[PDB]
Amino acid sequence: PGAGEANYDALELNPFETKKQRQEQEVRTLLNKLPADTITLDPNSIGSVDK
Amino acid sequence: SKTRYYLEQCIPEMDDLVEKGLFTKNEVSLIMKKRTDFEHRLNSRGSSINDYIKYINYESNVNKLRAKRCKRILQVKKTNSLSDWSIQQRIGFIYQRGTNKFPQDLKFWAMYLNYMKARGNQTSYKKIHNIYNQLLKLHPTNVDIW
Amino acid sequence: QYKKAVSSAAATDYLLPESNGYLEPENELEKTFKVQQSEIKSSVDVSTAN
Amino acid sequence: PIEYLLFEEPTGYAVFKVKLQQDDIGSRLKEVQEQINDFGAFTKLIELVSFAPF
Amino acid sequence: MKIKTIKRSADDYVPVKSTQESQMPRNLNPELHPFERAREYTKALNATKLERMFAKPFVGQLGYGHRDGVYAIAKNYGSLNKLATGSADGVIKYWNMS
Amino acid sequence: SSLSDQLAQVASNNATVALDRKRRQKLHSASLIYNSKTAATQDYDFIFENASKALEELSQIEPKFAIFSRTLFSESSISLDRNVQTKEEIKDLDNAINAYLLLASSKWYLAPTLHATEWLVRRFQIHVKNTEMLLLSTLNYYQTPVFKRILSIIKLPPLFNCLSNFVRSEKPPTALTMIKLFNDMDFLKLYTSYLDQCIKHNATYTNQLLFTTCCFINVVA
Amino acid sequence: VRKLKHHEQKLLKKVDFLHRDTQVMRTYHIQNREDYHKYNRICGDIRRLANKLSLLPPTDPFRRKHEQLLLDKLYAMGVLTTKSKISDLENKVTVSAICRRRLPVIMHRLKMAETIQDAVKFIEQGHVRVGPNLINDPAYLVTRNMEDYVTWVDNSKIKKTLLRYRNQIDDFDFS
Amino acid sequence: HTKRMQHVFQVKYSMDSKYIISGSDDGNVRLWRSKAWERSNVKTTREKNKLEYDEKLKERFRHMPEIKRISRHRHVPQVIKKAQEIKNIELSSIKRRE
Amino acid sequence: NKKNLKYQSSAVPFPFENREQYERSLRMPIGQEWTSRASHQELIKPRIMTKPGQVIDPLKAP
Questions:
Q1: Inter-residue contact E19 to F26 (CB < 8 Å)
Q2: For chain A, what is the total number of helices (H) and then of strands (E)?
Q3: Please, which domain of life does this record's source organism belong to (chain D)?
Q4: F83 to chain C: which residues are within 8 Å by CB?
Q5: Which of B67, E70, F43, I20 has the greatest CB tally within 10 Å of its CB?
Q6: Distance, CA of F14 to CA of F8 (rounded, Å)
Q7: Residue E72, C-beta contacts closer than 8 angstroms, at least 6 positions apart
């Protein structure tokens, strides 16, 4: 009865995807793929400052 | 998109309406399902005056239900809230959108005028003027309108 | 500014499209783990049963 | 500063209200000339207001 | 034993018409949208790359020019087409930049 | 039982669920009066207003249809969906629709019946969920554009392969083909059950009985 | 993936994880991409043997004997026709030479079948024999002498019809 | 900078703030874009929002080393490059004798 | 877990005065996926905005 999350988010994952939406979104994610070395233990370590 | 803009603009009065004890979460959510259906039908191409009219009719019935609900559940003629004028403001917004999209339909223009005049207690003498100015400019050779 | 942002997120929450589903007893004699997949399929919607 | 325009037609006069102004210096550029051709951008620049038929 | 599950109305998600634009549910749950810093950093980096490949400054020159080098320019502070240029030849011109 | 078979079974179960835009335009484009384009573009409100007018005309013809106006022809009937109801409510729908087809088998020469049944097709997907009843209802009108269109939009249960060969052609099915159909032995049991239902509900008429008896004669012949 | 547009090409010019191989596929009809890669790797193997044997001191009986062994064995395989050179070995041993040594191509130049695809169909249907024994798999490089002794299997419809046209059929041999 | 523009003697910035006019003594009155991107056409609201979002994001991440390297790389004539390194040398000299 | 310099920033960008101002703004995100539409707009509204083809007189008020 309560396993999956009832209300998803279209910008990320559509259970309903017309072929054109799917391919367009594929190119979208391909553009914005994160660099491999961004993977770290704390996903905020990009922001800070040092000199 | 623009539908998202309209829905979020609708949120706060919904917040107020649930906050005051006269609409349950589920009922309000159903109301928003219907709202979203209408919003997409207007925004998407191929829409028609029938869609605008049905949207208006649904909202008017919601307003009536809200009025009777506040009459019954707390026996107050008028809550000093945001909603009580929010629904009619949205109806006016619908009329304006419909007429800016189909300035041809005399029947819709006339529904607009009848609504605004009949609710004329709170409305503007000036607002009737503006509607009539715009209509006359668009259809100068309608002696019926004149 | 941050607080304005999170209040906006909460309003979106009023705007969500659906609702999670649950499973509760109503009672004390019977317990949840005693239900059977046949019982659920009988008691629920045909799209899910399919 | 082009607030309105007048357009004569075989079936009567039309008057349009200019909503935005295309930039005045860039007018000779490929980009603004194309937006004149396209219909989507012309609607953003112009909305009809009046129409008196003959 | 009151139960219910996630039931979707295909009528609600996939519109009956063909022209009608399907709806895009949105959920602003932070755990649903996972990478803020890395995602936005790459959006900004792509943005600067696009800036560099769209920088095209020169837009054009004004007629055939002046014979002998330009030494006076004065824009019209009232209008927007008009400037006035003048050259060491002694010849002054009033340009329509539109 | 190969995985392909098992998935064919599941596709049959989910025949009428529109899981994406393309499948929806198929299921909605299938229609009785309008061609594919206009069918795909129009809406439940339009279809339903036409249905209300048509069924009002039919009720004026004979008073029986009022109950269907009450139960299958309301704005609530605009709202509901086949797929999100439970098994019991599915059976209730099926009983109601079978009763309506039994009534409507008698006036298949009226554009009112054509329009009302068009509503029923387009909203409750009879042309997929229950086609045996529909075909059995309209079988004796087999020389009519209405029946040609029903073949065009239908999916054929395994008994009607003869009509299957005549789908999407231009010439009407012939008496000899109908005689093959009846000459089957299982189909005879099916049609026997249908006549039993018609009799117990006292809803029989000449043309239908003529076609039934002529087919039985030619079967024994 | 989508024939992606100009600007996004410029950002992502190299993101495609999805044509001499195909050219030979069409010109001499070799069987598969892995087949073509096999021939390329064979040629590379030969090249590297040449390089390393050259690195070996040229004034060595071992190196020179092994060179002559290699070149003779290649000649016997019939990929090349000459014997007097080594630069021949480094240059003209080609996927083209191997693929023209391929059996259906041999059938075509020796004129068994009018086309490469008809030749391969005949190999499948089992109508050819090399010396005693017949051949079923086209990717069969035929040695010099053997390709000289290729012909049909006996009592096949193909030979029967050939002889019928010639009016030289002879049923004693049950041709 | 251009190979065909020399001794900029007069500069005037335009009354719509969008363009730059430059009179140069080779006899020419060129005119340039103030921001080298902003095409003059009218932009659909979606595109406009995306562009403003671009600008906000890169103002946010302006000082990250990769983005700074990319958005500061601009090609300059060799005369200006060499003059700049010489001028830097002279300033270092002054500074350390001081 | 030594932090990475290439993705470490360099100096507080302009519109901020202090490192902590900078850090908190980095805590708040802009993109469409993390804020409602209205908040996304008013966060990306640029400081100075001009109408397209009009002339900008200097201000005059007393």
A1: no
A2: 1, 0
A3: Eukaryota
A4: 45-47
A5: E70
A6: 10
A7: E84, E85, E86, E87, E92, H10, H23
